[PDB]
Amino acid sequence: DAIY
Amino acid sequence: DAIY
Amino acid sequence: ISGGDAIYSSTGRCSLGFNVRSGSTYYFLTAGHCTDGATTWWANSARTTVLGTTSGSSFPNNDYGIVRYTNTTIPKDGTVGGQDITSAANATVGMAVTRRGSTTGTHSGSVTALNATVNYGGGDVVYGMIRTNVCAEPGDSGGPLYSGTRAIGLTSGGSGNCSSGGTTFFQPVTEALSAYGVSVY
Amino acid sequence: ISGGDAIYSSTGRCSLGFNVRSGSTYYFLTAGHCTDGATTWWANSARTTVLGTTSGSSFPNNDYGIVRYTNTTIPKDGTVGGQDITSAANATVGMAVTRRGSTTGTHSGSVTALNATVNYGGGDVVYGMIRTNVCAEPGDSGGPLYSGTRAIGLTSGGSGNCSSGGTTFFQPVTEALSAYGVSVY
Ligand SMILES: [Cl-]
Ligand SMILES: [Cl-]
Ligand SMILES: [Cl-]
Ligand SMILES: [Cl-]
Structure with missing residues:
Protein backbone atom coordinates (compact mmCIF):
# COMPACT_ATOMS: atom_id res chain seq x y z
CA ASP A 1 0.00 0.00 0.00
CA ALA A 2 0.86 3.60 -0.93
CA ILE A 3 -0.37 6.98 0.31
CA TYR A 4 -2.65 8.93 -1.99
CA ASP B 1 -2.42 7.42 -26.83
CA ALA B 2 -4.69 4.63 -25.55
CA ILE B 3 -8.46 4.14 -25.54
CA TYR B 4 -10.24 4.53 -22.23
CA ILE C 1 -28.69 6.85 -14.68
CA GLY C 78 -31.05 14.79 -18.45
CA THR C 79 -28.38 16.51 -16.35
CA VAL C 80 -24.60 15.98 -16.06
CA GLY C 81 -23.60 16.50 -12.44
CA GLY C 82 -26.06 19.41 -11.83
CA GLN C 83 -25.89 20.74 -15.35
CA ASP C 84 -28.97 20.50 -17.84
CA ILE C 85 -27.76 19.53 -21.37
CA THR C 86 -30.17 20.77 -23.98
CA SER C 87 -28.23 21.30 -27.19
CA ALA C 88 -24.99 20.36 -29.01
CA ALA C 89 -22.26 22.59 -30.33
CA ASN C 90 -18.85 22.31 -32.17
CA ALA C 91 -15.72 22.71 -30.14
CA THR C 92 -13.54 25.74 -30.61
CA VAL C 93 -9.92 26.19 -29.59
CA GLY C 94 -9.89 27.60 -26.10
CA MET C 95 -13.39 26.61 -25.17
CA ALA C 96 -13.81 25.69 -21.49
CA VAL C 97 -15.00 22.13 -21.16
CA THR C 98 -15.88 19.56 -18.50
CA ARG C 99 -15.76 15.78 -18.73
CA ARG C 100 -17.46 13.22 -16.47
CA GLY C 101 -16.68 9.54 -16.42
CA SER C 102 -17.10 6.54 -14.20
CA THR C 103 -13.40 6.01 -13.34
CA THR C 104 -12.37 9.56 -12.51
CA GLY C 105 -15.55 11.58 -12.06
CA THR C 106 -15.66 15.24 -13.14
CA HIS C 107 -12.60 17.10 -14.51
CA SER C 108 -12.28 20.35 -16.47
CA GLY C 109 -9.94 22.09 -18.87
CA SER C 110 -9.77 23.62 -22.34
CA VAL C 111 -10.05 22.54 -25.95
CA THR C 112 -6.47 22.73 -27.32
CA ALA C 113 -6.81 21.49 -30.98
CA LEU C 114 -9.57 20.43 -33.46
CA ASN C 115 -9.54 17.74 -36.11
CA ALA C 116 -6.84 15.64 -34.44
CA THR C 117 -5.98 12.23 -35.71
CA VAL C 118 -5.36 9.71 -32.93
CA ASN C 119 -3.67 6.36 -33.59
CA TYR C 120 -4.57 3.74 -31.02
CA GLY C 121 -2.47 1.12 -32.78
CA GLY C 122 -3.49 -2.12 -34.51
CA GLY C 123 -5.34 -0.31 -37.38
CA ASP C 124 -7.56 1.67 -35.02
CA VAL C 125 -7.09 5.27 -36.12
CA VAL C 126 -9.71 7.92 -35.33
CA TYR C 127 -10.01 11.27 -37.15
CA GLY C 128 -11.67 14.51 -36.55
CA MET C 129 -11.07 14.51 -32.77
CA ILE C 130 -11.20 17.30 -30.22
CA ARG C 131 -8.00 17.53 -28.26
CA THR C 132 -8.01 18.83 -24.70
CA ASN C 133 -5.84 19.17 -21.60
CA VAL C 134 -8.51 17.32 -19.54
CA CYS C 135 -7.34 14.08 -17.95
CA ALA C 136 -9.09 10.70 -18.19
CA GLU C 137 -8.37 7.07 -17.32
CA PRO C 138 -9.52 3.62 -18.47
CA GLY C 139 -13.30 3.26 -17.94
CA ASP C 140 -13.95 6.89 -18.61
CA SER C 141 -14.49 6.22 -22.33
CA GLY C 142 -17.81 7.29 -23.65
CA GLY C 143 -18.52 9.87 -21.03
CA PRO C 144 -19.68 13.35 -21.82
CA LEU C 145 -17.67 16.48 -22.63
CA TYR C 146 -19.84 19.52 -22.11
CA SER C 147 -19.74 23.29 -21.80
CA GLY C 148 -22.58 24.86 -19.89
CA THR C 149 -25.85 23.48 -21.35
CA ARG C 150 -24.05 22.27 -24.61
CA ALA C 151 -22.96 18.77 -25.39
CA ILE C 152 -19.59 18.84 -27.11
CA GLY C 153 -17.96 15.37 -27.20
CA LEU C 154 -17.65 11.78 -26.11
CA THR C 155 -14.53 10.57 -24.33
CA SER C 156 -12.34 8.49 -26.69
CA GLY C 157 -8.76 8.14 -25.33
CA GLY C 158 -5.57 9.90 -24.59
CA SER C 159 -2.46 9.87 -22.52
CA GLY C 160 -1.49 10.62 -18.93
CA ASN C 161 -3.82 10.32 -15.99
CA CYS C 162 -5.73 12.32 -13.41
CA SER C 163 -3.02 12.24 -10.76
CA SER C 164 -0.30 13.98 -12.84
CA GLY C 165 -2.28 15.32 -15.78
CA GLY C 166 -3.08 14.21 -19.27
CA THR C 167 -4.33 14.85 -22.76
CA THR C 168 -7.70 13.50 -23.75
CA PHE C 169 -9.36 13.29 -27.17
CA PHE C 170 -13.08 13.38 -27.77
CA GLN C 171 -15.38 12.41 -30.63
CA PRO C 172 -17.48 15.43 -31.47
CA ILE D 1 -15.27 24.53 -1.78
CA GLY D 78 -21.51 21.55 4.13
CA THR D 79 -22.53 18.87 1.62
CA VAL D 80 -20.56 16.09 -0.10
CA GLY D 81 -21.85 15.73 -3.65
CA GLY D 82 -25.54 16.37 -2.73
CA GLN D 83 -25.31 14.82 0.69
CA ASP D 84 -25.55 16.97 4.01
CA ILE D 85 -22.96 15.75 6.60
CA THR D 86 -24.09 16.55 10.09
CA SER D 87 -22.55 14.01 12.43
CA ALA D 88 -19.71 11.44 12.74
CA ALA D 89 -19.90 7.75 13.42
CA ASN D 90 -17.54 4.70 13.82
CA ALA D 91 -17.23 2.32 10.93
CA THR D 92 -18.62 -1.17 11.21
CA VAL D 93 -17.79 -4.19 9.07
CA GLY D 94 -20.20 -4.22 6.17
CA MET D 95 -21.23 -0.62 6.38
CA ALA D 96 -21.96 0.96 2.99
CA VAL D 97 -19.65 3.88 2.37
CA THR D 98 -18.87 6.50 -0.27
CA ARG D 99 -15.60 8.33 -0.88
CA ARG D 100 -15.03 11.54 -2.85
CA GLY D 101 -11.67 12.83 -3.93
CA SER D 102 -10.16 15.20 -6.43
CA THR D 103 -8.43 12.60 -8.65
CA THR D 104 -11.21 10.06 -9.04
CA GLY D 105 -14.42 11.73 -7.89
CA THR D 106 -17.11 9.68 -6.11
CA HIS D 107 -16.83 5.90 -5.57
CA SER D 108 -18.68 3.52 -3.24
CA GLY D 109 -18.25 0.19 -1.53
CA SER D 110 -18.20 -1.47 1.89
CA VAL D 111 -16.13 -1.42 5.05
CA THR D 112 -14.25 -4.76 5.05
CA ALA D 113 -12.06 -4.58 8.26
CA LEU D 114 -11.49 -2.26 11.28
CA ASN D 115 -8.31 -1.43 13.13
CA ALA D 116 -6.00 -2.21 10.21
CA THR D 117 -2.34 -1.41 10.36
CA VAL D 118 -0.99 -0.02 7.08
CA ASN D 119 2.75 0.19 6.39
CA TYR D 120 3.60 2.84 3.83
CA GLY D 121 7.32 2.10 4.14
CA GLY D 122 10.16 4.29 5.41
CA GLY D 123 8.90 4.28 9.06
CA ASP D 124 5.45 5.56 8.11
CA VAL D 125 3.07 3.07 9.69
CA VAL D 126 -0.53 4.01 10.45
CA TYR D 127 -2.78 2.14 12.91
CA GLY D 128 -6.40 1.93 13.63
CA MET D 129 -7.49 2.22 9.97
CA ILE D 130 -10.77 1.40 8.27
CA ARG D 131 -10.27 -0.97 5.39
CA THR D 132 -12.63 -0.90 2.42
CA ASN D 133 -13.08 -2.24 -1.11
CA VAL D 134 -13.44 1.36 -2.42
CA CYS D 135 -10.82 2.41 -4.95
CA ALA D 136 -8.70 5.58 -4.80
CA GLU D 137 -5.70 7.06 -6.60
CA PRO D 138 -2.93 9.59 -5.86
CA GLY D 139 -4.46 13.01 -5.06
CA ASP D 140 -7.51 11.50 -3.47
CA SER D 141 -5.86 11.54 -0.03
CA GLY D 142 -7.70 13.45 2.59
CA GLY D 143 -11.08 13.23 0.99
CA PRO D 144 -14.19 12.21 2.84
CA LEU D 145 -15.61 8.74 3.50
CA TYR D 146 -19.25 9.05 4.44
CA SER D 147 -22.44 7.06 4.89
CA GLY D 148 -25.65 8.99 4.49
CA THR D 149 -25.41 12.11 6.71
CA ARG D 150 -22.46 10.57 8.78
CA ALA D 151 -18.81 11.35 8.38
CA ILE D 152 -16.79 8.17 8.76
CA GLY D 153 -13.19 8.62 7.54
CA LEU D 154 -10.48 10.46 5.70
CA THR D 155 -8.75 8.88 2.70
CA SER D 156 -5.24 7.67 3.65
CA GLY D 157 -3.88 5.17 1.05
CA GLY D 158 -4.22 1.77 -0.40
CA SER D 159 -3.59 -0.36 -3.40
CA GLY D 160 -5.08 -0.81 -6.87
CA ASN D 161 -6.88 1.88 -8.77
CA CYS D 162 -10.30 2.94 -10.02
CA SER D 163 -10.00 1.29 -13.43
CA SER D 164 -9.52 -2.30 -12.15
CA GLY D 165 -10.43 -1.97 -8.48
CA GLY D 166 -8.61 -1.45 -5.25
CA THR D 167 -8.43 -1.47 -1.49
CA THR D 168 -8.42 1.82 0.34
CA PHE D 169 -7.74 2.60 4.01
CA PHE D 170 -9.22 5.51 5.91
CA GLN D 171 -8.40 7.32 9.13
CA PRO D 172 -11.50 7.30 11.27
CL1 LIG E 1 -3.22 19.51 -25.47
CL1 LIG F 1 0.16 20.20 -8.64
CL1 LIG G 1 -10.84 -5.38 1.54
CL1 LIG H 1 -15.96 -5.06 -14.85
Whole structure:
Protein backbone atom coordinates (compact mmCIF):
# COMPACT_ATOMS: atom_id res chain seq x y z
CA ASP A 1 0.00 0.00 0.00
CA ALA A 2 0.86 3.60 -0.93
CA ILE A 3 -0.37 6.98 0.31
CA TYR A 4 -2.65 8.93 -1.99
CA ASP B 1 -2.42 7.42 -26.83
CA ALA B 2 -4.69 4.63 -25.55
CA ILE B 3 -8.46 4.14 -25.54
CA TYR B 4 -10.24 4.53 -22.23
CA ILE C 1 -28.69 6.85 -14.68
CA SER C 2 -26.97 10.00 -16.04
CA GLY C 3 -24.10 11.06 -18.26
CA GLY C 4 -20.80 9.97 -16.80
CA ASP C 5 -22.17 6.95 -14.91
CA ALA C 6 -20.84 3.45 -15.29
CA ILE C 7 -22.23 1.14 -17.98
CA TYR C 8 -21.30 -2.48 -18.09
CA SER C 9 -21.02 -4.87 -20.98
CA SER C 10 -20.33 -8.63 -20.68
CA THR C 11 -16.62 -7.90 -20.81
CA GLY C 12 -16.02 -4.57 -19.05
CA ARG C 13 -17.04 -1.08 -18.10
CA CYS C 14 -17.38 2.22 -19.97
CA SER C 15 -19.25 5.40 -19.25
CA LEU C 16 -22.60 6.72 -20.43
CA GLY C 17 -22.18 9.83 -22.65
CA PHE C 18 -25.45 11.53 -23.00
CA ASN C 19 -29.04 10.51 -22.81
CA VAL C 20 -30.79 11.26 -26.12
CA ARG C 21 -34.20 11.00 -27.72
CA SER C 22 -36.02 10.68 -31.06
CA GLY C 23 -39.63 11.45 -30.24
CA SER C 24 -40.70 9.30 -27.31
CA THR C 25 -37.80 6.85 -27.78
CA TYR C 26 -34.87 7.00 -25.39
CA TYR C 27 -31.24 5.99 -26.05
CA PHE C 28 -27.79 6.85 -24.79
CA LEU C 29 -24.59 7.63 -26.65
CA THR C 30 -21.23 6.21 -25.68
CA ALA C 31 -17.89 5.45 -27.40
CA GLY C 32 -17.87 3.37 -30.52
CA HIS C 33 -14.95 1.32 -29.18
CA CYS C 34 -17.28 0.36 -26.37
CA THR C 35 -20.26 -0.55 -28.49
CA ASP C 36 -18.18 -2.41 -31.09
CA GLY C 37 -17.82 -5.49 -28.94
CA ALA C 38 -20.91 -5.31 -26.77
CA THR C 39 -24.57 -5.93 -27.52
CA THR C 40 -26.27 -5.72 -24.04
CA TRP C 41 -25.55 -3.13 -21.45
CA TRP C 42 -26.20 -3.21 -17.74
CA ALA C 43 -26.28 -0.51 -15.01
CA ASN C 44 -24.54 -2.62 -12.38
CA SER C 45 -21.39 -4.62 -12.02
CA ALA C 46 -23.49 -7.70 -11.14
CA ARG C 47 -24.93 -7.54 -14.73
CA THR C 48 -28.56 -7.81 -13.56
CA THR C 49 -30.18 -4.36 -14.16
CA VAL C 50 -30.39 -4.26 -18.03
CA LEU C 51 -30.15 -0.90 -19.71
CA GLY C 52 -30.60 -1.79 -23.32
CA THR C 53 -29.06 -2.99 -26.58
CA THR C 54 -26.54 -1.50 -28.92
CA SER C 55 -28.12 -0.20 -32.01
CA GLY C 56 -25.27 1.58 -33.80
CA SER C 57 -21.51 1.63 -33.53
CA SER C 58 -18.82 3.57 -35.42
CA PHE C 59 -15.23 2.81 -34.54
CA PRO C 60 -12.46 3.26 -35.71
CA ASN C 61 -12.41 6.35 -38.07
CA ASN C 62 -15.01 7.79 -35.70
CA ASP C 63 -15.57 6.84 -32.04
CA TYR C 64 -19.28 6.89 -31.27
CA GLY C 65 -22.15 4.46 -30.68
CA ILE C 66 -25.67 4.27 -29.47
CA VAL C 67 -27.66 2.02 -27.15
CA ARG C 68 -31.49 1.93 -27.17
CA TYR C 69 -33.02 1.65 -23.74
CA THR C 70 -35.16 -1.46 -23.12
CA ASN C 71 -35.51 -0.74 -19.34
CA THR C 72 -38.66 1.37 -19.23
CA THR C 73 -38.67 2.29 -15.53
CA ILE C 74 -34.99 3.21 -14.81
CA PRO C 75 -34.57 7.01 -14.51
CA LYS C 76 -32.86 8.53 -17.57
CA ASP C 77 -31.64 11.83 -16.22
CA GLY C 78 -31.05 14.79 -18.45
CA THR C 79 -28.38 16.51 -16.35
CA VAL C 80 -24.60 15.98 -16.06
CA GLY C 81 -23.60 16.50 -12.44
CA GLY C 82 -26.06 19.41 -11.83
CA GLN C 83 -25.89 20.74 -15.35
CA ASP C 84 -28.97 20.50 -17.84
CA ILE C 85 -27.76 19.53 -21.37
CA THR C 86 -30.17 20.77 -23.98
CA SER C 87 -28.23 21.30 -27.19
CA ALA C 88 -24.99 20.36 -29.01
CA ALA C 89 -22.26 22.59 -30.33
CA ASN C 90 -18.85 22.31 -32.17
CA ALA C 91 -15.72 22.71 -30.14
CA THR C 92 -13.54 25.74 -30.61
CA VAL C 93 -9.92 26.19 -29.59
CA GLY C 94 -9.89 27.60 -26.10
CA MET C 95 -13.39 26.61 -25.17
CA ALA C 96 -13.81 25.69 -21.49
CA VAL C 97 -15.00 22.13 -21.16
CA THR C 98 -15.88 19.56 -18.50
CA ARG C 99 -15.76 15.78 -18.73
CA ARG C 100 -17.46 13.22 -16.47
CA GLY C 101 -16.68 9.54 -16.42
CA SER C 102 -17.10 6.54 -14.20
CA THR C 103 -13.40 6.01 -13.34
CA THR C 104 -12.37 9.56 -12.51
CA GLY C 105 -15.55 11.58 -12.06
CA THR C 106 -15.66 15.24 -13.14
CA HIS C 107 -12.60 17.10 -14.51
CA SER C 108 -12.28 20.35 -16.47
CA GLY C 109 -9.94 22.09 -18.87
CA SER C 110 -9.77 23.62 -22.34
CA VAL C 111 -10.05 22.54 -25.95
CA THR C 112 -6.47 22.73 -27.32
CA ALA C 113 -6.81 21.49 -30.98
CA LEU C 114 -9.57 20.43 -33.46
CA ASN C 115 -9.54 17.74 -36.11
CA ALA C 116 -6.84 15.64 -34.44
CA THR C 117 -5.98 12.23 -35.71
CA VAL C 118 -5.36 9.71 -32.93
CA ASN C 119 -3.67 6.36 -33.59
CA TYR C 120 -4.57 3.74 -31.02
CA GLY C 121 -2.47 1.12 -32.78
CA GLY C 122 -3.49 -2.12 -34.51
CA GLY C 123 -5.34 -0.31 -37.38
CA ASP C 124 -7.56 1.67 -35.02
CA VAL C 125 -7.09 5.27 -36.12
CA VAL C 126 -9.71 7.92 -35.33
CA TYR C 127 -10.01 11.27 -37.15
CA GLY C 128 -11.67 14.51 -36.55
CA MET C 129 -11.07 14.51 -32.77
CA ILE C 130 -11.20 17.30 -30.22
CA ARG C 131 -8.00 17.53 -28.26
CA THR C 132 -8.01 18.83 -24.70
CA ASN C 133 -5.84 19.17 -21.60
CA VAL C 134 -8.51 17.32 -19.54
CA CYS C 135 -7.34 14.08 -17.95
CA ALA C 136 -9.09 10.70 -18.19
CA GLU C 137 -8.37 7.07 -17.32
CA PRO C 138 -9.52 3.62 -18.47
CA GLY C 139 -13.30 3.26 -17.94
CA ASP C 140 -13.95 6.89 -18.61
CA SER C 141 -14.49 6.22 -22.33
CA GLY C 142 -17.81 7.29 -23.65
CA GLY C 143 -18.52 9.87 -21.03
CA PRO C 144 -19.68 13.35 -21.82
CA LEU C 145 -17.67 16.48 -22.63
CA TYR C 146 -19.84 19.52 -22.11
CA SER C 147 -19.74 23.29 -21.80
CA GLY C 148 -22.58 24.86 -19.89
CA THR C 149 -25.85 23.48 -21.35
CA ARG C 150 -24.05 22.27 -24.61
CA ALA C 151 -22.96 18.77 -25.39
CA ILE C 152 -19.59 18.84 -27.11
CA GLY C 153 -17.96 15.37 -27.20
CA LEU C 154 -17.65 11.78 -26.11
CA THR C 155 -14.53 10.57 -24.33
CA SER C 156 -12.34 8.49 -26.69
CA GLY C 157 -8.76 8.14 -25.33
CA GLY C 158 -5.57 9.90 -24.59
CA SER C 159 -2.46 9.87 -22.52
CA GLY C 160 -1.49 10.62 -18.93
CA ASN C 161 -3.82 10.32 -15.99
CA CYS C 162 -5.73 12.32 -13.41
CA SER C 163 -3.02 12.24 -10.76
CA SER C 164 -0.30 13.98 -12.84
CA GLY C 165 -2.28 15.32 -15.78
CA GLY C 166 -3.08 14.21 -19.27
CA THR C 167 -4.33 14.85 -22.76
CA THR C 168 -7.70 13.50 -23.75
CA PHE C 169 -9.36 13.29 -27.17
CA PHE C 170 -13.08 13.38 -27.77
CA GLN C 171 -15.38 12.41 -30.63
CA PRO C 172 -17.48 15.43 -31.47
CA VAL C 173 -21.04 14.67 -30.45
CA THR C 174 -22.73 16.49 -33.28
CA GLU C 175 -21.66 13.79 -35.81
CA ALA C 176 -23.24 11.07 -33.64
CA LEU C 177 -26.45 13.05 -33.23
CA SER C 178 -26.74 13.52 -36.92
CA ALA C 179 -25.85 9.92 -37.80
CA TYR C 180 -28.47 8.56 -35.43
CA GLY C 181 -31.18 11.19 -35.75
CA VAL C 182 -31.41 11.97 -32.03
CA SER C 183 -31.23 14.97 -29.76
CA VAL C 184 -29.49 15.32 -26.45
CA TYR C 185 -31.36 16.19 -23.29
CA ILE D 1 -15.27 24.53 -1.78
CA SER D 2 -16.64 21.18 -0.51
CA GLY D 3 -15.48 17.79 0.71
CA GLY D 4 -13.67 15.94 -2.03
CA ASP D 5 -12.45 19.04 -3.88
CA ALA D 6 -8.84 19.69 -4.73
CA ILE D 7 -6.56 21.49 -2.27
CA TYR D 8 -3.14 22.59 -3.25
CA SER D 9 0.00 23.01 -1.21
CA SER D 10 3.30 24.47 -2.51
CA THR D 11 4.35 20.99 -3.56
CA GLY D 12 1.23 19.12 -4.69
CA ARG D 13 -2.44 18.34 -4.47
CA CYS D 14 -4.65 16.50 -1.97
CA SER D 15 -8.35 16.54 -1.29
CA LEU D 16 -10.47 18.38 1.25
CA GLY D 17 -12.06 15.94 3.76
CA PHE D 18 -14.77 17.69 5.60
CA ASN D 19 -15.54 21.22 6.50
CA VAL D 20 -15.74 21.60 10.30
CA ARG D 21 -16.42 24.22 12.92
CA SER D 22 -15.75 25.21 16.55
CA GLY D 23 -18.26 27.96 17.25
CA SER D 24 -17.99 30.57 14.52
CA THR D 25 -14.54 29.36 13.41
CA TYR D 26 -14.24 27.36 10.22
CA TYR D 27 -11.60 24.75 9.31
CA PHE D 28 -11.26 21.70 7.10
CA LEU D 29 -9.86 18.25 7.81
CA THR D 30 -7.58 16.42 5.43
CA ALA D 31 -4.88 13.71 5.65
CA GLY D 32 -2.03 14.13 8.05
CA HIS D 33 0.45 13.06 5.37
CA CYS D 34 -0.78 16.07 3.44
CA THR D 35 -0.55 18.58 6.25
CA ASP D 36 2.81 17.29 7.49
CA GLY D 37 4.75 19.05 4.77
CA ALA D 38 2.48 21.96 3.93
CA THR D 39 1.68 25.16 5.80
CA THR D 40 -0.48 27.17 3.29
CA TRP D 41 -3.24 25.76 1.20
CA TRP D 42 -4.78 27.10 -1.96
CA ALA D 43 -8.02 26.31 -3.86
CA ASN D 44 -6.47 26.53 -7.31
CA SER D 45 -3.58 25.04 -9.19
CA ALA D 46 -2.25 28.57 -9.87
CA ARG D 47 -1.73 28.93 -6.05
CA THR D 48 -3.49 32.32 -5.88
CA THR D 49 -6.84 31.73 -4.04
CA VAL D 50 -5.62 31.05 -0.41
CA LEU D 51 -7.70 28.75 1.72
CA GLY D 52 -5.86 28.85 4.98
CA THR D 53 -3.03 27.53 7.16
CA THR D 54 -2.34 24.18 8.70
CA SER D 55 -3.00 24.17 12.34
CA GLY D 56 -2.59 20.51 13.32
CA SER D 57 -1.10 17.43 11.74
CA SER D 58 -0.85 13.80 12.90
CA PHE D 59 1.01 11.41 10.66
CA PRO D 60 2.25 8.65 10.82
CA ASN D 61 0.56 6.50 13.59
CA ASN D 62 -2.59 8.39 12.66
CA ASP D 63 -3.36 10.10 9.33
CA TYR D 64 -5.29 13.30 9.96
CA GLY D 65 -4.73 17.07 9.95
CA ILE D 66 -6.54 20.33 10.07
CA VAL D 67 -6.37 23.63 8.21
CA ARG D 68 -7.95 26.84 9.58
CA TYR D 69 -9.61 28.96 6.95
CA THR D 70 -8.18 32.48 6.50
CA ASN D 71 -10.29 33.18 3.34
CA THR D 72 -13.43 34.71 4.80
CA THR D 73 -15.52 34.99 1.62
CA ILE D 74 -14.95 31.61 -0.16
CA PRO D 75 -18.01 29.34 0.20
CA LYS D 76 -17.43 26.50 2.68
CA ASP D 77 -20.12 24.05 1.71
CA GLY D 78 -21.51 21.55 4.13
CA THR D 79 -22.53 18.87 1.62
CA VAL D 80 -20.56 16.09 -0.10
CA GLY D 81 -21.85 15.73 -3.65
CA GLY D 82 -25.54 16.37 -2.73
CA GLN D 83 -25.31 14.82 0.69
CA ASP D 84 -25.55 16.97 4.01
CA ILE D 85 -22.96 15.75 6.60
CA THR D 86 -24.09 16.55 10.09
CA SER D 87 -22.55 14.01 12.43
CA ALA D 88 -19.71 11.44 12.74
CA ALA D 89 -19.90 7.75 13.42
CA ASN D 90 -17.54 4.70 13.82
CA ALA D 91 -17.23 2.32 10.93
CA THR D 92 -18.62 -1.17 11.21
CA VAL D 93 -17.79 -4.19 9.07
CA GLY D 94 -20.20 -4.22 6.17
CA MET D 95 -21.23 -0.62 6.38
CA ALA D 96 -21.96 0.96 2.99
CA VAL D 97 -19.65 3.88 2.37
CA THR D 98 -18.87 6.50 -0.27
CA ARG D 99 -15.60 8.33 -0.88
CA ARG D 100 -15.03 11.54 -2.85
CA GLY D 101 -11.67 12.83 -3.93
CA SER D 102 -10.16 15.20 -6.43
CA THR D 103 -8.43 12.60 -8.65
CA THR D 104 -11.21 10.06 -9.04
CA GLY D 105 -14.42 11.73 -7.89
CA THR D 106 -17.11 9.68 -6.11
CA HIS D 107 -16.83 5.90 -5.57
CA SER D 108 -18.68 3.52 -3.24
CA GLY D 109 -18.25 0.19 -1.53
CA SER D 110 -18.20 -1.47 1.89
CA VAL D 111 -16.13 -1.42 5.05
CA THR D 112 -14.25 -4.76 5.05
CA ALA D 113 -12.06 -4.58 8.26
CA LEU D 114 -11.49 -2.26 11.28
CA ASN D 115 -8.31 -1.43 13.13
CA ALA D 116 -6.00 -2.21 10.21
CA THR D 117 -2.34 -1.41 10.36
CA VAL D 118 -0.99 -0.02 7.08
CA ASN D 119 2.75 0.19 6.39
CA TYR D 120 3.60 2.84 3.83
CA GLY D 121 7.32 2.10 4.14
CA GLY D 122 10.16 4.29 5.41
CA GLY D 123 8.90 4.28 9.06
CA ASP D 124 5.45 5.56 8.11
CA VAL D 125 3.07 3.07 9.69
CA VAL D 126 -0.53 4.01 10.45
CA TYR D 127 -2.78 2.14 12.91
CA GLY D 128 -6.40 1.93 13.63
CA MET D 129 -7.49 2.22 9.97
CA ILE D 130 -10.77 1.40 8.27
CA ARG D 131 -10.27 -0.97 5.39
CA THR D 132 -12.63 -0.90 2.42
CA ASN D 133 -13.08 -2.24 -1.11
CA VAL D 134 -13.44 1.36 -2.42
CA CYS D 135 -10.82 2.41 -4.95
CA ALA D 136 -8.70 5.58 -4.80
CA GLU D 137 -5.70 7.06 -6.60
CA PRO D 138 -2.93 9.59 -5.86
CA GLY D 139 -4.46 13.01 -5.06
CA ASP D 140 -7.51 11.50 -3.47
CA SER D 141 -5.86 11.54 -0.03
CA GLY D 142 -7.70 13.45 2.59
CA GLY D 143 -11.08 13.23 0.99
CA PRO D 144 -14.19 12.21 2.84
CA LEU D 145 -15.61 8.74 3.50
CA TYR D 146 -19.25 9.05 4.44
CA SER D 147 -22.44 7.06 4.89
CA GLY D 148 -25.65 8.99 4.49
CA THR D 149 -25.41 12.11 6.71
CA ARG D 150 -22.46 10.57 8.78
CA ALA D 151 -18.81 11.35 8.38
CA ILE D 152 -16.79 8.17 8.76
CA GLY D 153 -13.19 8.62 7.54
CA LEU D 154 -10.48 10.46 5.70
CA THR D 155 -8.75 8.88 2.70
CA SER D 156 -5.24 7.67 3.65
CA GLY D 157 -3.88 5.17 1.05
CA GLY D 158 -4.22 1.77 -0.40
CA SER D 159 -3.59 -0.36 -3.40
CA GLY D 160 -5.08 -0.81 -6.87
CA ASN D 161 -6.88 1.88 -8.77
CA CYS D 162 -10.30 2.94 -10.02
CA SER D 163 -10.00 1.29 -13.43
CA SER D 164 -9.52 -2.30 -12.15
CA GLY D 165 -10.43 -1.97 -8.48
CA GLY D 166 -8.61 -1.45 -5.25
CA THR D 167 -8.43 -1.47 -1.49
CA THR D 168 -8.42 1.82 0.34
CA PHE D 169 -7.74 2.60 4.01
CA PHE D 170 -9.22 5.51 5.91
CA GLN D 171 -8.40 7.32 9.13
CA PRO D 172 -11.50 7.30 11.27
CA VAL D 173 -12.78 10.85 11.45
CA THR D 174 -14.01 10.72 15.02
CA GLU D 175 -10.40 10.73 16.38
CA ALA D 176 -9.62 13.91 14.40
CA LEU D 177 -12.79 15.60 15.60
CA SER D 178 -11.99 14.84 19.15
CA ALA D 179 -8.31 15.81 18.89
CA TYR D 180 -9.16 19.17 17.39
CA GLY D 181 -12.40 19.97 19.19
CA VAL D 182 -14.48 20.52 16.05
CA SER D 183 -17.69 19.27 14.54
CA VAL D 184 -18.41 18.33 10.97
CA TYR D 185 -21.07 20.08 8.94
CL1 LIG E 1 -15.96 -5.06 -14.85
CL1 LIG F 1 -3.22 19.51 -25.47
CL1 LIG G 1 0.16 20.20 -8.64
CL1 LIG H 1 -10.84 -5.38 1.54
